[PDB]
Every structure is written in structure tokens, then in C-alpha cells.
Amino acid sequence: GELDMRKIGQARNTLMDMRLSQVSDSVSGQTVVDPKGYLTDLNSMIPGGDINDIKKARLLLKSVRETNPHHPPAWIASARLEEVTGKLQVARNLIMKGTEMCPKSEDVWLEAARLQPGDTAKAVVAQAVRHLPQSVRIYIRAAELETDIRAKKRVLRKALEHVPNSV
Amino acid sequence: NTQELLDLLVKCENKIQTRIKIGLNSKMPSRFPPVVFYTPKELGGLGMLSMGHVLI
Amino acid sequence: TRMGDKAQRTKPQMQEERRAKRRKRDEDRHDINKMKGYTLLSEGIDEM
Amino acid sequence: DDTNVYRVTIHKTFEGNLTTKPINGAIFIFNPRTGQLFLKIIHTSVWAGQKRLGQ
């Protein structure tokens, strides 16, 4: 009767696709990522709040750090603003810059110990003890980040030799 | 090496200069100075970079 | 006509300010680099 | 000389965060040529929640 031009094209395309899939069924390691799993696990890391408010808070922390580099409350606020949003490496770098710009600060040293890993927190506690000795908070942070019995005993002995008047 | 390319560049520069002159002077300017064309932008000229043999 | 005539190799500008900033960064981190490898528990010349 | 116009709590709270409470700022206008002093105070509300940068 009537001419169905698209019919022959569709049939040929289907035959070609079937033949290719038969050939493609012989593949070795073709990977496949299930959209169901990816979409379901997409919200497994979803939420910092407003991006503009976090940017204004970071700009205010940068302005407070530029107006007062030797302020360990400003350094602690900049480290908290960089740790609550973004990455922790920038927070550790800001805490190290605040500890280098504001020496003999126990709060900046505690923020540098909390923002950095323990292999860096031990060196941060050593630098805090070298810059401001007889600190009970720095000694507690050094003894808590030892993860050993003999290391914590040596840290407690060093704290008792430095400050024996600590209950 | 492409002498044809050099001739084409010279012709293109001449055409651009003629268009600029027409835009400036209604008639045909008898040998308008290259200072009008080749002077840098900072000095107020057109700042033309040309590979022709325009002897000052 | 040469092939490098009027050809000038640009130079890095503001090199003195970059050298002064590098010298300030090296002088500001002298005490941190002097006690970088010295720990508080595994060092014998730490307290001294 | 209104450098100190900017004002905020920047106070480390006990835990969780730090008090991000802006303070009511002000500007300084004094005339030593006449021994005058006029202070225009800038409320923290004007400087908070305006959706703008420092410029």
C-alpha cells in the first residue's frame, strides 16, 4: 500500500545494533556504572550554609588577620572559617601562619594542633613548648597525641619536670 | 620565501591605508605621511604593524 | 635584513620584589626550619 | 580618620564556633583648627546583611 520510508531504516538500524551487541557481548572488561547507585549515593555527601555568607565571613577573617596578624583570636577565627568551609589543608596553613605571626599563644597552638594531623600536631606542640614552655594545655595535647604508653609516660615526666605545680 | 605572500601583505597594507585615508580625507590624499598611520597608540597614532618597505 | 633584527627577549620584571619576598619568607621561617626535625619525645638535644 | 569604623565580636565561643557578632561602628571627625569633635556612629545593622563587599 503506502510507502513507509523510515521502516526499512529502523529495521536496518535495529539489525546493525543487534549484530554489534552480539559482537560487543564478547568484550572483556567493559565497565558500567549503575545510574541507580550513583544517584542514590549522590546525596550521601550532600550538606556549610550560604556561600555568600561564608565568603563574607572569610573576607572578614582575612581583614582581621591583615589588621592584626598577632591576634590568636583572629587566627583562631580564620582557622575555624577555613576548616568549617573548604579544605582542612588551608585551615592548617592558616593556623601555622597564625602561630608563626602570634608566638607564645596557647589558643593558636591548640588550633594548630586541632587543624593539623597528629604527625604535624606533635611538631606543633614541640614548637609551642619551645616558644611558650610550662603550658598545661600544650603538654596535654602532646600527651594525648602520643598514642602509646611509654611516650605518654615520657610526656608526663617532661611535663612534671617543666611544671611540677600542675595538679 | 613566498614572494606572493609579501606582495599580498603589501597590497593589504596599502588597501588598509587607503581605507583609513578615505575615512579621514574625502578626496585622495597625495602621499599622506606614515606618521598618521604608523605612530603608536600611546602617541595618538593608529599603531599599525606593517611588514612593508615604508622608508621614513 | 636579518631574522632576529628588532627581536628582543623580554626579561622578568619585578624580580627584585620577588627576591625580597623570598628573602623575607626565608628569614621569617628560620626558627621553624632550625627545629623542624627536632621532636619533644624522640630527641635528646631538644631541651638542652 | 575612620579606620576603626569596622567593628565585630570576633570572640572565641566556648565550643562549636566563635561569636560572629558585628559591633556598632562609627566614624571620627575632629577639627584641631577649631577644637571640635563630631562623631557619626555606624550601626552594625547597616553593615550587616547588606549583601555587598567592603568596597
Add this chain to the structure above:
Amino acid sequence: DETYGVNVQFESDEEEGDEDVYGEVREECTLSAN
């Protein structure tokens, strides 16, 4: 110290010329057929 009250300085500072600020270098299965 307490230091209640800290002024801020928000300006358009920090100008980087697409280069390291200091001279020191800033540089730092398989498809097959079964």
C-alpha cells in the same frame, strides 16, 4: 589577652601577575575482548 573589639580592613589588595609572588619556583579492568 581579651582584646574585645578588632577593626577590619577590607580592600582590593593582592595583585598577582600570573606568576609566583616570590622568585623561588612555586612549582610543587582494561578495554578488551573476552
Add this chain to the structure above:
Amino acid sequence: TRLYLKAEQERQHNYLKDGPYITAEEAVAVYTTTVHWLESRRFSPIPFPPLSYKHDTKLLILALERLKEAYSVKSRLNQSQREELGLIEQAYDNPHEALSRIKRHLLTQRA
């Protein structure tokens, strides 16, 4: 441009009518050759972007920059151009949300 568009429409209609020009046997042979070449090269397939790709942020920023460079500072921009610039700014504002939206569009938006 109108003539070229009409000719391209006619060519697409004829391709649909005449079906795939490439024969099934030739296509199968080409696919077999490509599979053999890939197996010899042992090319590990490029998987879908993981949820925690190490350089996802860098790649997204590079793509946003390369797309923004087209929009040079002109006298004005069209409404579609303005919307594109706004979307680029929003992507530069929330990289994580933009990457999530891109992944959702890639896995779902097949039309």
C-alpha cells in the same frame, strides 16, 4: 545558510530513509579491529566521575574558565548570554553543587 540547512535536512531525511550507510558486516569488522587494538594497548576504560574524584574541582574550574573565555567584554550581552554568565558565576560560587548538577544531568538528561 538557509540552503545549507535545507540540504542538511534533506540529507538527514534520506539517511533515515536509506538507513545506515555502513553495512552490518563492515561495522562488525571495524568494531572487532578496534577491540583488538584496545586489548593490545590494554586501555583501561575511563569510568564515570566518582563522588570523590581527586581532581574534580580542578577539572570543573578549568572547564568553567575555558567556557568563560569565549564571553569577551563587549558592549552588551544577550539574555541567553546573560543567563550563561550567571550560571558560570553560580558554578564558580558553589563548585560542589555545580558538579552534582553536572553529574545528575550526565546520568539522566539523555534528551
Add this chain to the structure above:
Amino acid sequence: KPLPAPLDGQRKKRGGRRYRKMKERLGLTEIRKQANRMSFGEIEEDAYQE
């Protein structure tokens, strides 16, 4: 598809918190400096940076 008549504004008498808001938000004031000067004596950018 009509064409707007060739007419313009009559006169300017208002300004400040009535027409200044539009001229500050939509037609916001640009830098207006360091972008219009040429420094006819020196040359800041390269010869062909454009």
C-alpha cells in the same frame, strides 16, 4: 511591529534616593579611573598585548 517615536526625555529635576538608586544599582558607577587614562608619555602594556 510599531517603531518607537523619535522622542527623548524632557528635563532632569529629580535625583538622590529617587533616581540615584537605579543609577547606583543598574547603571552602577564603574572604576572611572585606571581604565580610561592612556599615559601618552609611557607604555604600560606590551606593544601587541591588546
Add this chain to the structure above:
Amino acid sequence: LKRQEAIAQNRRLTLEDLEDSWDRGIPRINTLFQKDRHTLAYDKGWRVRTDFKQYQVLKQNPFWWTHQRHDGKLWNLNNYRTDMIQALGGVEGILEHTLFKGTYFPTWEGLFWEKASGFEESMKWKKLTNAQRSGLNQIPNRRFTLWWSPTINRANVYVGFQVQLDL
């Protein structure tokens, strides 16, 4: 070799080192020291994306070979500008054909030219018609003609058509 030598002493390669080579270098103008070198190097496929960009934008880019921010500045024509300024008769000789003398500006280094700023904004912050836009765009042509008017108004430049301005 210089990077290896610096690594031998465990130090960064300063910009002072091989500075002149900046213009030179394997990538056109060596720009390894340029900002975001690590960021750009992670994103490959620059050449194909630049060549394929011809079908994505309706503007013909003559720099289809390589990108300035990816390969580096392949040329330095500042010497050409200086040579063109000098070979025209120097700054004084160039300005001699211009109307700088009539401006009574005794500072050939302090004067600043308003680039597209003679008017308020040449009515650009408005909704004028196309004819007004064309007139505004042709206004700089009048200024350019006026600047080089003495070199162009000479009776030895055009044909003899002496006409005196009224009054």
C-alpha cells in the same frame, strides 16, 4: 639542568635564575614560574580544544596555534614599538606633526589621554537609537583626525583646495 642542580641542594629554582630565559624556553616564553602552573597542567587537550573552538564561537581567532596562557608568549614586539617610535623622529619628532605643541603641555611624560572618556560615557549608559550609537562610535574618528590634523591639513598633503574658516 638548573632545576636538577637546585634540587641537589634541596632548594626552589628562583626567578633570578635563568630570568632572561623567560622569553625563551621550550614553551615559547618559559612561564613555568607563572601562577597556577600546577592547576593548568592538570587539564590537558589544549590544542584540540583551541582548534575545535572555531565551530563553537562565531569569532575567528587568529591565534589558533597555541594559547598565551598555556604555551607562553611566542613573541616580544616591544622593541618593535620602540624602534618605530625612534625611527619616526623620536617622541619630539612624532609630536611635531601633531597638535601637542598647541596644547601648551610642557610635560611629554605627565599628560594622560582619556581613552573613550571625553564625554560622560558618550551616552553609553542609555538607550539611544542606532544612529546615535553610530555617531558616538564615529566621534573618536574626529578626535584622531584633530590630533594628527597639522600633518594632514598641509597643502602639500592634499590637492590645492584652499578654504579659510569663517571669521
